[PDB]
Write a protein that binds this ligand. Structure first.
Ligand SMILES: CN(C)CCNC(=O)NC[C@H]1CC[C@@H]2[C@H](O1)c1cc(C(F)(F)F)ccc1N[C@H]2c1ccccc1
Ligand SMILES: Nc1ncnc2c1ncn2[C@@H]1O[C@H](COP(=O)(O)OP(=O)(O)O)[C@@H](O)[C@H]1O
Length: 331
Protein backbone atom coordinates (compact mmCIF):
# COMPACT_ATOMS: atom_id res chain seq x y z
CA UNK A 1 0.00 0.00 0.00
CA UNK A 2 1.11 3.52 0.93
CA UNK A 3 1.82 4.48 4.55
CA UNK A 4 0.79 7.95 5.68
CA UNK A 5 3.69 10.33 5.06
CA UNK A 6 4.77 12.39 8.06
CA UNK A 7 6.99 15.47 8.07
CA UNK A 8 8.06 17.78 10.86
CA UNK A 9 8.45 21.52 10.60
CA UNK A 10 10.17 23.51 13.34
CA UNK A 11 9.57 27.25 13.22
CA UNK A 12 12.23 29.85 14.06
CA UNK A 13 12.54 32.00 17.19
CA UNK A 14 10.19 34.98 17.05
CA UNK A 15 11.41 38.57 17.51
CA UNK A 16 10.17 38.40 21.11
CA UNK A 17 12.43 35.38 21.67
CA UNK A 18 15.72 36.44 20.07
CA UNK A 19 15.89 39.58 22.25
CA UNK A 20 16.05 37.17 25.18
CA UNK A 21 18.70 35.09 23.42
CA UNK A 22 16.58 31.97 23.85
CA UNK A 23 18.40 28.63 23.72
CA UNK A 24 16.88 26.09 21.34
CA UNK A 25 16.25 22.54 22.55
CA UNK A 26 15.48 21.40 19.02
CA UNK A 27 17.95 20.23 16.38
CA UNK A 28 16.87 19.30 12.86
CA UNK A 29 18.79 17.26 10.30
CA UNK A 30 16.91 16.92 6.95
CA UNK A 31 19.47 14.63 5.34
CA UNK A 32 19.05 12.18 8.21
CA UNK A 33 15.32 12.99 8.32
CA UNK A 34 15.67 13.36 12.09
CA UNK A 35 14.64 15.77 14.80
CA UNK A 36 16.52 15.74 18.10
CA UNK A 37 15.18 17.20 21.35
CA UNK A 38 17.12 18.15 24.48
CA UNK A 39 15.22 16.64 27.44
CA UNK A 40 17.48 17.86 30.23
CA UNK A 41 21.04 18.54 31.34
CA UNK A 42 23.24 21.29 29.93
CA UNK A 43 24.49 22.60 26.58
CA UNK A 44 27.86 21.13 27.53
CA UNK A 45 26.32 17.79 28.45
CA UNK A 46 22.79 16.46 27.99
CA UNK A 47 20.36 13.72 27.02
CA UNK A 48 18.14 13.89 23.95
CA UNK A 49 15.29 12.02 22.28
CA UNK A 50 15.46 11.44 18.53
CA UNK A 51 12.82 10.63 15.94
CA UNK A 52 12.96 9.84 12.24
CA UNK A 53 10.23 11.00 9.89
CA UNK A 54 9.60 10.94 6.15
CA UNK A 55 10.92 14.50 6.03
CA UNK A 56 12.15 17.17 8.40
CA UNK A 57 12.36 20.93 7.94
CA UNK A 58 14.14 23.32 10.29
CA UNK A 59 13.71 26.98 11.25
CA UNK A 60 15.40 28.15 8.04
CA UNK A 61 12.80 26.51 5.78
CA UNK A 62 10.91 28.90 3.53
CA UNK A 63 7.35 28.50 2.23
CA UNK A 64 8.69 27.72 -1.24
CA UNK A 65 10.78 24.87 0.18
CA UNK A 66 7.70 23.28 1.73
CA UNK A 67 5.64 23.63 -1.42
CA UNK A 68 8.26 22.25 -3.79
CA UNK A 69 9.18 19.21 -1.72
CA UNK A 70 5.81 18.12 -0.29
CA UNK A 71 2.89 19.81 -2.02
CA UNK A 72 3.89 19.81 -5.70
CA UNK A 73 4.07 15.99 -5.82
CA UNK A 74 0.72 15.70 -4.04
CA UNK A 75 -0.98 18.23 -6.29
CA UNK A 76 0.19 16.26 -9.32
CA UNK A 77 -1.62 13.16 -8.02
CA UNK A 78 -4.69 15.31 -7.50
CA UNK A 79 -4.42 16.47 -11.12
CA UNK A 80 -4.24 12.81 -12.20
CA UNK A 81 -7.72 12.51 -10.75
CA UNK A 82 -6.95 11.22 -7.25
CA UNK A 83 -7.96 12.28 -3.74
CA UNK A 84 -5.39 13.74 -1.38
CA UNK A 85 -5.35 15.15 2.15
CA UNK A 86 -2.78 17.12 4.13
CA UNK A 87 -3.13 17.63 7.88
CA UNK A 88 -1.35 20.32 9.95
CA UNK A 89 -0.91 19.14 13.57
CA UNK A 90 0.73 20.73 16.58
CA UNK A 91 0.61 23.11 19.51
CA UNK A 92 -1.05 26.51 19.11
CA UNK A 93 1.48 29.04 17.82
CA UNK A 94 3.82 26.53 16.18
CA UNK A 95 2.97 27.21 12.52
CA UNK A 96 -0.15 25.34 11.39
CA UNK A 97 -1.87 28.34 9.84
CA UNK A 98 1.43 29.80 8.66
CA UNK A 99 2.18 26.60 6.77
CA UNK A 100 -1.29 25.87 5.36
CA UNK A 101 -2.31 29.43 4.55
CA UNK A 102 0.68 31.70 5.10
CA UNK A 103 0.35 35.46 5.56
CA UNK A 104 1.03 38.78 3.82
CA UNK A 105 4.48 40.28 4.12
CA UNK A 106 4.33 43.62 5.98
CA UNK A 107 3.93 47.06 4.41
CA UNK A 108 2.55 45.73 1.11
CA UNK A 109 5.96 44.69 -0.26
CA UNK A 110 4.72 42.13 -2.80
CA UNK A 111 1.54 41.26 -4.63
CA UNK A 112 -0.10 38.13 -3.25
CA UNK A 113 1.28 36.05 -6.13
CA UNK A 114 4.87 36.92 -5.23
CA UNK A 115 4.63 37.17 -1.45
CA UNK A 116 7.19 34.66 -0.10
CA UNK A 117 5.06 34.25 3.04
CA UNK A 118 2.24 32.70 1.03
CA UNK A 119 1.37 29.23 2.30
CA UNK A 120 0.12 25.96 0.79
CA UNK A 121 -3.43 27.03 -0.09
CA UNK A 122 -2.75 30.13 -2.17
CA UNK A 123 0.25 28.52 -3.91
CA UNK A 124 -1.89 25.48 -4.73
CA UNK A 125 -4.78 27.42 -6.24
CA UNK A 126 -2.32 29.61 -8.19
CA UNK A 127 -0.28 26.69 -9.57
CA UNK A 128 -3.49 24.86 -10.49
CA UNK A 129 -4.43 27.63 -12.96
CA UNK A 130 -0.80 27.61 -14.08
CA UNK A 131 -0.22 23.94 -14.85
CA UNK A 132 -3.68 23.32 -16.29
CA UNK A 133 -4.24 26.56 -18.21
CA UNK A 134 -0.84 25.65 -19.65
CA UNK A 135 -2.35 22.52 -21.20
CA UNK A 136 -5.47 22.56 -23.36
CA UNK A 137 -7.27 21.09 -20.37
CA UNK A 138 -10.93 22.02 -20.00
CA UNK A 139 -11.17 22.49 -16.23
CA UNK A 140 -13.18 24.00 -13.42
CA UNK A 141 -12.24 24.66 -9.79
CA UNK A 142 -14.46 24.72 -6.70
CA UNK A 143 -13.46 25.47 -3.12
CA UNK A 144 -15.18 25.04 0.23
CA UNK A 145 -14.10 25.92 3.76
CA UNK A 146 -15.75 23.82 6.44
CA UNK A 147 -14.91 24.50 10.06
CA UNK A 148 -15.68 22.60 13.26
CA UNK A 149 -15.96 24.32 16.64
CA UNK A 150 -17.34 22.45 19.66
CA UNK A 151 -18.68 19.74 17.33
CA UNK A 152 -20.75 22.23 15.32
CA UNK A 153 -20.17 22.84 11.58
CA UNK A 154 -19.69 26.27 9.99
CA UNK A 155 -19.32 27.55 6.43
CA UNK A 156 -16.50 30.09 6.35
CA UNK A 157 -16.84 31.00 2.64
CA UNK A 158 -20.59 31.60 2.25
CA UNK A 159 -20.89 35.37 1.60
CA UNK A 160 -24.66 35.09 1.97
CA UNK A 161 -25.17 33.69 5.47
CA UNK A 162 -23.25 34.66 8.61
CA UNK A 163 -20.98 32.21 10.45
CA UNK A 164 -23.54 31.73 13.23
CA UNK A 165 -25.53 29.64 10.74
CA UNK A 166 -24.55 26.07 11.66
CA UNK A 167 -24.67 23.27 9.08
CA UNK A 168 -26.08 19.73 9.19
CA UNK A 169 -24.30 16.55 8.12
CA UNK A 170 -25.72 13.12 7.33
CA UNK A 171 -24.38 9.78 6.12
CA UNK A 172 -24.34 9.57 2.34
CA UNK A 173 -26.85 7.04 0.91
CA UNK A 174 -24.18 5.64 -1.41
CA UNK A 175 -20.51 5.97 -0.32
CA UNK A 176 -20.08 4.25 3.06
CA UNK A 177 -16.94 6.23 3.86
CA UNK A 178 -18.62 9.50 2.94
CA UNK A 179 -21.16 11.94 4.36
CA UNK A 180 -23.46 14.71 3.12
CA UNK A 181 -22.95 18.28 4.34
CA UNK A 182 -26.17 20.23 3.87
CA UNK A 183 -25.55 23.88 3.11
CA UNK A 184 -21.81 23.72 2.52
CA UNK A 185 -21.16 26.41 -0.07
CA UNK A 186 -18.91 25.46 -2.96
CA UNK A 187 -17.32 28.44 -4.67
CA UNK A 188 -16.29 28.27 -8.30
CA UNK A 189 -12.92 29.88 -8.99
CA UNK A 190 -12.78 31.04 -12.61
CA UNK A 191 -9.16 32.30 -12.64
CA UNK A 192 -6.18 33.00 -10.36
CA UNK A 193 -7.10 36.68 -10.50
CA UNK A 194 -10.13 35.68 -8.44
CA UNK A 195 -8.33 33.52 -5.89
CA UNK A 196 -7.16 36.22 -3.50
CA UNK A 197 -10.66 37.68 -3.17
CA UNK A 198 -12.13 34.35 -2.13
CA UNK A 199 -9.47 33.88 0.56
CA UNK A 200 -9.95 37.41 1.90
CA UNK A 201 -13.63 36.70 2.43
CA UNK A 202 -12.71 33.60 4.38
CA UNK A 203 -10.25 35.45 6.60
CA UNK A 204 -12.88 38.12 7.22
CA UNK A 205 -15.53 35.59 8.19
CA UNK A 206 -13.05 33.96 10.52
CA UNK A 207 -12.84 37.30 12.35
CA UNK A 208 -16.56 37.33 13.03
CA UNK A 209 -16.25 33.70 14.16
CA UNK A 210 -13.49 34.75 16.56
CA UNK A 211 -15.84 37.36 18.00
CA UNK A 212 -18.67 34.87 18.55
CA UNK A 213 -16.72 31.84 19.81
CA UNK A 214 -14.11 31.65 22.56
CA UNK A 215 -10.53 31.03 21.43
CA UNK A 216 -11.93 30.16 17.99
CA UNK A 217 -8.60 30.20 16.15
CA UNK A 218 -7.01 27.63 18.44
CA UNK A 219 -9.97 25.34 19.22
CA UNK A 220 -11.53 25.04 15.76
CA UNK A 221 -10.61 22.57 12.99
CA UNK A 222 -10.75 23.80 9.39
CA UNK A 223 -11.03 21.85 6.15
CA UNK A 224 -10.25 23.81 3.00
CA UNK A 225 -11.14 21.61 0.07
CA UNK A 226 -10.42 22.12 -3.58
CA UNK A 227 -12.05 20.04 -6.30
CA UNK A 228 -10.82 20.11 -9.90
CA UNK A 229 -13.08 18.91 -12.71
CA UNK A 230 -10.98 18.31 -15.81
CA UNK A 231 -11.82 17.47 -19.43
CA UNK A 232 -8.40 16.65 -20.83
CA UNK A 233 -7.71 16.67 -24.57
CA UNK A 234 -4.24 15.10 -24.86
CA UNK A 235 -2.14 15.84 -27.97
CA UNK A 236 -3.40 12.52 -29.35
CA UNK A 237 -6.90 13.97 -29.56
CA UNK A 238 -8.42 11.66 -26.91
CA UNK A 239 -10.56 13.40 -24.29
CA UNK A 240 -10.23 11.97 -20.76
CA UNK A 241 -12.38 13.16 -17.85
CA UNK A 242 -10.81 13.46 -14.40
CA UNK A 243 -11.93 14.64 -10.96
CA UNK A 244 -9.35 15.70 -8.42
CA UNK A 245 -9.91 16.67 -4.79
CA UNK A 246 -7.48 17.95 -2.15
CA UNK A 247 -8.21 18.55 1.54
CA UNK A 248 -6.02 20.98 3.48
CA UNK A 249 -6.77 20.33 7.13
CA UNK A 250 -5.64 22.71 9.88
CA UNK A 251 -6.36 20.99 13.22
CA UNK A 252 -7.14 22.57 16.57
CA UNK A 253 -4.15 23.13 18.85
CA UNK A 254 -2.83 19.89 20.36
CA UNK A 255 -1.73 21.38 23.70
CA UNK A 256 -3.01 19.84 26.93
CA UNK A 257 -13.53 19.28 25.55
CA UNK A 258 -12.53 18.85 21.90
CA UNK A 259 -14.36 15.71 20.81
CA UNK A 260 -12.94 15.81 17.28
CA UNK A 261 -9.36 16.15 18.47
CA UNK A 262 -9.73 13.36 21.05
CA UNK A 263 -11.35 11.07 18.47
CA UNK A 264 -8.70 11.69 15.81
CA UNK A 265 -6.12 10.50 18.31
CA UNK A 266 -8.15 7.42 19.15
CA UNK A 267 -8.67 6.68 15.44
CA UNK A 268 -4.93 6.87 14.82
CA UNK A 269 -4.21 4.57 17.76
CA UNK A 270 -6.82 2.07 16.59
CA UNK A 271 -5.32 2.06 13.10
CA UNK A 272 -1.71 1.66 14.25
CA UNK A 273 -2.55 -1.04 16.81
CA UNK A 274 -4.57 -2.74 14.08
CA UNK A 275 -7.52 -2.78 16.47
CA UNK A 276 -10.72 -4.23 14.86
CA UNK A 277 -12.82 -1.22 15.84
CA UNK A 278 -11.91 2.25 14.56
CA UNK A 279 -14.06 4.97 16.18
CA UNK A 280 -14.60 7.18 13.09
CA UNK A 281 -18.22 7.84 13.98
CA UNK A 282 -17.42 9.27 17.44
CA UNK A 283 -16.75 12.78 16.00
CA UNK A 284 -17.63 15.11 13.09
CA UNK A 285 -13.98 15.50 12.09
CA UNK A 286 -13.24 11.79 11.79
CA UNK A 287 -16.55 11.01 10.08
CA UNK A 288 -15.86 13.70 7.49
CA UNK A 289 -12.27 12.58 6.87
CA UNK A 290 -12.83 8.85 7.34
CA UNK A 291 -11.33 8.07 3.93
CA UNK A 292 -8.14 10.01 4.78
CA UNK A 293 -7.50 7.77 7.79
CA UNK A 294 -6.86 4.22 6.63
CA UNK A 295 -9.01 4.75 3.55
CA UNK A 296 -8.40 5.29 -0.17
CA UNK A 297 -7.03 8.85 -0.02
CA UNK A 298 -3.33 9.72 -0.18
CA UNK A 299 -2.53 11.28 3.19
CA UNK A 300 0.31 13.32 4.66
CA UNK A 301 0.70 15.04 8.03
CA UNK A 302 2.77 18.16 8.71
CA UNK A 303 3.53 18.32 12.42
CA UNK A 304 4.67 21.75 13.57
CA UNK A 305 6.82 22.40 16.64
CA UNK A 306 8.48 25.13 18.66
CA UNK A 307 12.22 25.09 19.39
CA UNK A 308 11.77 26.76 22.80
CA UNK A 309 12.70 24.97 26.02
CA UNK A 310 9.37 26.14 27.50
CA UNK A 311 7.39 23.99 25.07
CA UNK A 312 9.34 20.78 25.70
CA UNK A 313 6.45 18.70 27.01
CA UNK A 314 4.16 19.76 24.14
CA UNK A 315 6.87 19.38 21.51
CA UNK A 316 7.61 15.84 22.71
CA UNK A 317 3.89 15.09 22.71
CA UNK A 318 3.62 16.32 19.13
CA UNK A 319 6.58 14.22 17.97
CA UNK A 320 5.39 11.01 19.64
CA UNK A 321 1.97 11.55 18.11
CA UNK A 322 3.32 12.21 14.62
CA UNK A 323 5.76 9.32 14.93
CA UNK A 324 2.90 6.88 15.58
CA UNK A 325 0.90 8.07 12.57
CA UNK A 326 3.68 6.91 10.22
CA UNK A 327 2.48 3.35 10.85
CA UNK A 328 -0.90 4.01 9.28
CA UNK A 329 -1.59 2.32 5.94
CA UNK A 330 -3.83 3.90 3.30
CA UNK A 331 -4.73 2.62 -0.19
C1 LIG B 1 -0.24 42.53 7.95
N1 LIG B 1 0.40 41.26 8.25
C2 LIG B 1 1.05 41.45 9.57
C3 LIG B 1 -0.66 40.24 8.42
C4 LIG B 1 -1.45 40.04 7.11
N2 LIG B 1 -1.99 38.68 7.02
C5 LIG B 1 -3.32 38.45 6.88
O1 LIG B 1 -4.15 39.39 6.84
N3 LIG B 1 -3.74 37.16 6.75
C6 LIG B 1 -5.15 36.80 6.54
C7 LIG B 1 -5.41 36.43 5.05
C8 LIG B 1 -4.30 37.02 4.11
C9 LIG B 1 -4.53 36.55 2.66
C10 LIG B 1 -4.85 35.04 2.55
C11 LIG B 1 -5.91 34.65 3.60
O2 LIG B 1 -5.43 34.99 4.91
C12 LIG B 1 -6.21 33.18 3.54
C13 LIG B 1 -7.47 32.72 3.95
C14 LIG B 1 -7.77 31.35 3.89
C15 LIG B 1 -9.14 30.84 4.33
F1 LIG B 1 -9.01 29.54 4.84
F2 LIG B 1 -9.70 31.68 5.29
F3 LIG B 1 -9.98 30.81 3.21
C16 LIG B 1 -6.81 30.44 3.41
C17 LIG B 1 -5.55 30.89 3.00
C18 LIG B 1 -5.24 32.26 3.05
N4 LIG B 1 -3.97 32.71 2.62
C19 LIG B 1 -3.59 34.15 2.71
C20 LIG B 1 -2.58 34.49 1.63
C21 LIG B 1 -1.29 34.85 2.02
C22 LIG B 1 -0.32 35.18 1.06
C23 LIG B 1 -0.63 35.15 -0.31
C24 LIG B 1 -1.93 34.78 -0.71
C25 LIG B 1 -2.91 34.45 0.25
N1 LIG C 1 8.14 28.93 9.79
C1 LIG C 1 7.81 30.05 10.31
N2 LIG C 1 8.58 31.18 10.06
C2 LIG C 1 8.30 32.44 10.59
N3 LIG C 1 7.25 32.68 11.39
C3 LIG C 1 6.47 31.60 11.66
C4 LIG C 1 6.66 30.30 11.18
N4 LIG C 1 5.68 29.47 11.65
C5 LIG C 1 4.91 30.28 12.41
N5 LIG C 1 5.34 31.57 12.43
C6 LIG C 1 4.75 32.76 13.16
O1 LIG C 1 4.40 32.42 14.49
C7 LIG C 1 3.01 32.73 14.80
C8 LIG C 1 2.18 31.46 14.99
O2 LIG C 1 1.93 30.76 13.75
P1 LIG C 1 0.49 30.18 13.42
O3 LIG C 1 0.68 29.54 12.07
O4 LIG C 1 -0.63 31.16 13.52
O5 LIG C 1 0.29 29.08 14.51
P2 LIG C 1 -0.84 27.98 14.69
O6 LIG C 1 -1.81 28.08 13.48
O7 LIG C 1 -0.13 26.65 14.81
O8 LIG C 1 -1.53 28.38 15.94
C9 LIG C 1 2.57 33.68 13.68
O9 LIG C 1 2.75 35.02 14.16
C10 LIG C 1 3.47 33.28 12.50
O10 LIG C 1 3.79 34.38 11.62
Amino acid sequence: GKNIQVVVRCRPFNLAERKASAHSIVECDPVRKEVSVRTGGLADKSSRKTYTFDMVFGASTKQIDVYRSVVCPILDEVIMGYNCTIFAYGQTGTGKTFTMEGERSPNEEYTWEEDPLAGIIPRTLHQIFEKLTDNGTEFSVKVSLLEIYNEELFDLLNPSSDVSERLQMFDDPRNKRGVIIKGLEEITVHNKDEVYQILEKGAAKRTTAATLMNAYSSRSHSVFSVTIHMKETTIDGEELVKIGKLNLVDLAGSENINQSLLTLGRVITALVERTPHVPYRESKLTRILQDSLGGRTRTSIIATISPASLNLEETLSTLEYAHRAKNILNK
